Amino acid sequence: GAAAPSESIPSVNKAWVYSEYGKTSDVLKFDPSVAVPEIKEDQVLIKVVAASLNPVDFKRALGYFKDTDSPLPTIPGYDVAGVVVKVGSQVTKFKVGDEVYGDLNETALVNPTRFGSLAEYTAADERVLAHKPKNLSFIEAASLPLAIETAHEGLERAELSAGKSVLVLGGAGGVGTHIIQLAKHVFGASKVAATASTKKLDLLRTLGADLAIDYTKENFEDLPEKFDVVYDAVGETDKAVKAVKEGGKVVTIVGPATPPAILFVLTSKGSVLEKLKPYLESGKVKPVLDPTSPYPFTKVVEAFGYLESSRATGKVVVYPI
Numbered sequence: 001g002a003a004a005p006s007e008s009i010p011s012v013n014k015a016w017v018y019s020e021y022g023k024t025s026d027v028l029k030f031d032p033s034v035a036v037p038e039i040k041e042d043q044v045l046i047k048v049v050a051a052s053l054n055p056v057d058f059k060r061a062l063g064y065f066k067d068t069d070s071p072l073p074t075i076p077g078y079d080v081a082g083v084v085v086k087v088g089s090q091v092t093k094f095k096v097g098d099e100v101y102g103d104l105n106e107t108a109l110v111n112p113t114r115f116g117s118l119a120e121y122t123a124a125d126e127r128v129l130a131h132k133p134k135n136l137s138f139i140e141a142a143s144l145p146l147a148i149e150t151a152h153e154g155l156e157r158a159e160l161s162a163g164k165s166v167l168v169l170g171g172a173g174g175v176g177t178h179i180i181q182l183a184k185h186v187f188g189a190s191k192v193a194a195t196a197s198t199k200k201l202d203l204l205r206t207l208g209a210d211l212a213i214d215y216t217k218e219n220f221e222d223l224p225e226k227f228d229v230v231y232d233a234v235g236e237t238d239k240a241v242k243a244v245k246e247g248g249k250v251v252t253i254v255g256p257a258t259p260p261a262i263l264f265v266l267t268s269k270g271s272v273l274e275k276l277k278p279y280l281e282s283g284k285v286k287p288v289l290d291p292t293s294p295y296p297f298t299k300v301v302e303a304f305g306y307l308e309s310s311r312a313t314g315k316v317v318v319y320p321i
């Protein structure tokens with residue numbers, strides 16, 4: 001991994017950009033000639049191969065986090081997989097040519113980068129990245145970071161450990177599909193229950209749920225069964241708190257949190273991906289892609305429109321970029 005020839009790295013590239021806050025159908029535009037970000041000393045420049053979309057991308061573009069956002073215009077996209085083309089002078093973990101993946105923004109809602117992953121090149125902190133598992137495609141790898149790390153962190157915060165039961169509210173989405181898998185296959189849960197609509201129950205069971213609950217036909221909080229952990233990925237802590245055992249833990253990723261539930265926002269860390277590497281290599285934990293993925297780089301507005309419908313099963317990925 002010797003330095004790339006310097007004239008081989010472009011200073012402008014194609015990207016999607018918004019210059020004002022609003023709906024993606026209104027504000028998100030393609031720009032054929034946007035600056036490539038200059039790297040800091042603890043960053044690498046990545047040739048982007050694929051990018052995933054997350055709800056945070058559209059909530060951020062609506063201006064929900066404006067008070068702690070970076071300056072507009074913004075190139076959206078948190079999740080990235082691609083190939084290192086340049087390394088900063090303080091970088092030790094990666095070299096030119098490494099295949100890497102991660103969620104660009106250490107603190108999702110505080111100073112996310114101006115130069116996201118929906119571009120041909122992006123700059124990423126060493127600390128947020130991991131080596132791409134060899135058995136995963138770039139589409140599959142791009143799908144993982146924000147959602148898998150959110151799932152992992154929430155389960156750790158809930159103190160999930162071997163033998164305990166957990167209920168997942170929103171089991172079929174980007175995050176919930178990993179909450180199920182991790183709970184069963186990484187945290188050793190004895191029983192994993194999860195909510196989704198009628199046609200998605202079989203998927204939940206396939207991913208590791210012992211009990212798939214159709215929220216369109218019954219209310220989980222009225223079940224007499226109560227859980228050691230409840231992980232809300234929808235935004236219904238009012239009910240979630242009614243499903244937990246005395247002394248158990250309720251976490252949510254969608255506030256506001258009704259005590260005793262807690263709301264957190266993930267911290268993006270490559271070390272979490274590295275910890276999960278063996279489960280990804282063995283296929284014990286798998287990427288989960290929406291059947292509509294991948295969306296070509298020309299179809300980013302449509303990819304966002306589909307994610308904004310709240311119906312995605314697993315991940316919406318953009319490729320090729």
Ligand SMILES: NC(=O)C1=CN([C@@H]2O[C@H](COP(=O)(O)OP(=O)(O)OC[C@H]3O[C@@H](n4cnc5c(N)ncnc54)[C@H](OP(=O)(O)O)[C@@H]3O)[C@@H](O)[C@H]2O)C=CC1
Pocket residue numbers: 054055056059146147150169170171172173174175176195196197198200215233234252253254264265266307310311312313314
């Ligand atoms: N605080 C943090 O750190 C983070 C917060 N988030 C937030 O978490 C939420 C989920 O994110 P993500 O998984 O990426 O979202 P997705 O858009 O991937 O979730 C879509 C899934 O949500 C399911 N869903 C919708 N309503 C319900 C319901 N009432 N009960 C059960 N399932 C339901 C749908 O299944 P169906 O079609 O069957 O309804 C669909 O499969 C978002 O609001 C996101 O902003 C995400 C990541 C990090």
Ligand SMILES: CC1=C(O)C(=O)CO1
Pocket residue numbers: 054055056059108109253254265266
């Ligand atoms: C990543 C993330 C979201 O999606 C939120 O809603 C809050 O933080």
